[PDB]
């Protein structure tokens, strides 16, 4: 929201609806296994 509501959830640190995921490790990322419900986001490190 931008007031009490969102700040309250800030205190419970609620994982959102569509959580923006961050790249786990430095390195190349690729695909694998098309939509079966999920999809492989194979982030293979180079280092």
């Amino acid at each position: 929201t931008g007031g009490l509501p969102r700040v309250a959830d800030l205190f419970e640190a609620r994982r959102p609806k569509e959580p923006a995921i961050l790249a786990e490790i430095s390195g190349i990322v690729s695909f694998g296994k098309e939509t079966k419900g999920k999809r492989r986001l194979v982030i293979t490190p180079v280092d």
Partner: protein, 668 residues
């Protein structure tokens, strides 16, 4: 049987012979709700207390309040009993009862003896934050309501409607010392959320000093010379010249050119009589330049802040009181009245409404043909009426800004219009040109029951007529306001509840530990303008590392240094933008915090000491604001375009296209 002692354990609620009664529960009897029935709202009606409404009291000095005789009796008896059998003006304590049984004038003098320098604690009921608790000195008042020092009520947010303050007697010398240690009136000057001297002249006192220091073109005596602001005092109290005449008076402004020795600098100033009188109140050290303005509310609060910076604590305190007494004094000299015949309405207002009429008529007709759609027509309408209000603004605002011209040393040299409205609108006290302009100009489009906007404005202003139509537009507004605050209140309390919940055990209990870490402090340069500076974040903190200057290999702020005003002015002499400060989340102190990781910004400006349980003071300070909670970008900042880490390239037409997502545009 053991279970019968707890409650009945988890058996079946053991009753007694022919009587439904789960037998006496020790568990619930020492504890209960909200912990126990002491540490809960159930903490009984305290002794040494007096619960009643409050009243003003101008003549009430800085370090004091006024207390009713009757409450005084009920709240000082034991002292009088011990004092009557101590001196020998009563034989026994029961004989003492009899003297006060008739209220003997004798015991009132003994009452005096136990009131003269007896610290008192004042705590209101609607108090959710610590700024509702202070300490004072008694003054015998023949009345029913507890009088209070005016320039403190703003912090209390305690008005005149039904605010009942409870008085709590600091009986032990410790509590009495705590009064005159941290809870004293002169001990709660800044807000424990930010270092500003929290009490800013609200409205009455502001206007007083506003009608004092002010300039114009026409004024009796404008031009003569005086060798002192003292005779300047005896010049206007008599009234042989006007309060805004530019008169040469020799004011002796001072300056702490030394480290405590304020070198004297006698200067001559062609100044207005009002601000000249303002100086007799101004403590030496402060520069005359700060009181050579047309008075501003932001300036008037930071004036005491700079009087706290330059002159320190003491000079600021005593000065604040002097202001209050003359605040009322010249407030009366103004006789700042406003009635129907004193207001002014532009007949250019109904002229802009004529314009505002034309356009909307034509747009609805475009819809009758079928050009603009309903929504298209919607916003179109809204925009022209908003711009119309700005024209109504550039109407009533310039009108009431400088339209008064007076014959003086030429044709008719204009001076800023002395309109009361103008004074409130420039003092900052209560004059909000937006409210005022919904009052004298077209109020505008009010929201709708949906949460959107009724495209119909409140054309007819408040001074002039209003219809039932305009009312119902604004009806959602009334509703809206009430609802939100009425509930934000409750949630803000549970907000502070969760805050105490989280930090109870944290105490600053060390000074230096062993960490050379903290986090990077950076100004929130985002969007257009640079909002929060590097300075105002670090203002009142402790430098983490040895920081270099934009100039290389030249350290300006050594590692452990307390950054205050001058050092912050030092930070802004060069162009250092990023500095690290030792953070408390990086604080190596085990189960506690060290001062070299916390800082100094508190309810004072000095070093945080060991003994300051900070967890809960954070709760209150942060939970307080609960009630106040709710295409093609052309660059407007004039600077150099610096492409940071972005890989752009020139192709046909010379367009510097972008091929990377990390396009961070900066304005070096």
């Amino acid at each position: 049987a053991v279970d019968a002692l707890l409650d009945n354990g988890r058996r079946g609620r053991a009753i007694t012979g022919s009587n439904k009664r789960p037998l006496k529960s020790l568990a619930d009897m020492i504890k209960g709700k909200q912990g126990r029935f002491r540490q809960n709202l159930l903490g009984k009606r305290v002794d040494y207390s007096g619960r009643s409404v409050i009243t003003v009291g101008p003549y009430l000095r800085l370090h004091q309040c006024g207390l009713p005789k009757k409450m005084a009796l009920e709240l000082f008896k034991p002292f009088i009993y011990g004092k009557l059998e101590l001196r020998g003006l009563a034989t026994t304590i029961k004989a003492a009862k009899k003297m006060v049984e008739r209220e003997e004038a004798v015991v009132w003098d003994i009452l005096d003896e136990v009131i003269r320098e007896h610290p008192v604690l004042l705590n209101r009921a609607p108090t959710l934050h610590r700024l509702g608790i202070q300490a004072f000195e008694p003054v015998l008042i023949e009345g029913k309501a507890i009088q209070l020092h005016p320039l403190v009520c703003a912090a209390y947010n305690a008005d005149f409607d039904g605010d009942q303050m409870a008085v709590h007697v600091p009986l032990t010398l410790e509590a009495q010392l705590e009064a005159r240690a941290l809870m004293m009136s002169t001990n709660n000057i800044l807000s424990p959320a930010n270092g500003e001297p929290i009490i800013v002249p609200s409205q009455d006192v502001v206007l007083g000093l506003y009608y004092m220091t002010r300039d114009c073109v026409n004024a009796k005596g404008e031009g003569m010379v005086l060798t002192g602001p003292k005779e300047a005092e005896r010049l206007y109290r008599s009234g042989l010249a006007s309060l805004h005449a530019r008169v040469k008076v020799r004011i002796t402004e001072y300056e702490k050119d030394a480290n405590g020795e304020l070198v004297a600098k006698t200067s001559l100033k062609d100044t207005t009589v009002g601000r000249a009188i303002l100086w007799m109140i101004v403590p030496k050290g402060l520069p005359y330049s700060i009181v050579n303005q047309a008075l501003g509310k932001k300036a008037i609060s930071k004036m005491l802040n700079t009087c706290y910076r330059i002159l320190g604590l003491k000079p600021t305190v005593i000065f604040a009181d002097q202001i209050m007494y003359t605040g009322f004094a010249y407030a009366a000299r103004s006789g700042a009245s406003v009635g129907i015949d004193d207001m002014v309405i532009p007949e250019k207002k109904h002229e802009i409404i004529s314009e505002a009429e034309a356009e909307v008529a034509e747009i609805q007709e475009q819809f009758q043909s079928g050009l603009v759609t309903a929504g298209e027509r919607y916003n179109k309408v809204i925009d022209i009426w908003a711009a119309a209000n700005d024209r109504v603004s550039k109407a009533m605002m310039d009108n009431l800004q400088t339209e008064t011209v007076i014959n003086r040393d030429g044709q008719e040299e204009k001076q800023v219009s002395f309109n009361s409205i103008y004074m409130m609108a420039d003092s900052g006290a209560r004059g909000s040109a937006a409210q005022i302009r919904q009052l004298a100009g077209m109020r505008g489009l009010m929201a709708k029951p949906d949460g959107s906007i009724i495209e119909t404005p409140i054309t007819a202003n408040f001074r002039e007529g209003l219809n039932v139509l305009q009312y119902f537009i604004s009806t959602h507004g009334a509703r809206k306001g009430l609802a939100d605050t009425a509930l934000k209140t409750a949630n803000s309390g549970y907000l502070t509840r969760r805050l105490v919940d989280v930090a109870q055990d944290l105490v600053v209990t060390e000074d230096d530990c062993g960490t050379h870490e903290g986090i990077m402090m950076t100004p929130v340069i985002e969007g257009g303008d640079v909002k929060e500076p590097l300075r105002d974040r670090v203002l009142g903190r402790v430098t983490a590392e040895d920081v270099l200057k934009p100039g290389t290999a030249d350290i300006l702020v050594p590692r452990n240094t307390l950054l205050h005003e001058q050092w912050c002015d030092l930070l802004e002499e060069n162009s250092v933008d990023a500095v690290k400060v030792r953070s408390v989340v990086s604080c190596d102190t085990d189960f506690g915090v060290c001062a070299h990781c916390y800082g100094r910004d508190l309810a004072r400006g000095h070093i945080i000491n060991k003994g300051e349980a900070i967890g809960v003071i954070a709760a209150q300070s942060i939970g307080e604001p609960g009630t106040q909670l709710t295409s093609s970008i052309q660059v407007k900042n004039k600077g150099s375009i610096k492409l940071s880490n972005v890989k752009s390239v020139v192709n046909s037409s010379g367009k510097l296209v972008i091929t990377s997502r990390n396009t961070e545009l900066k304005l070096i």
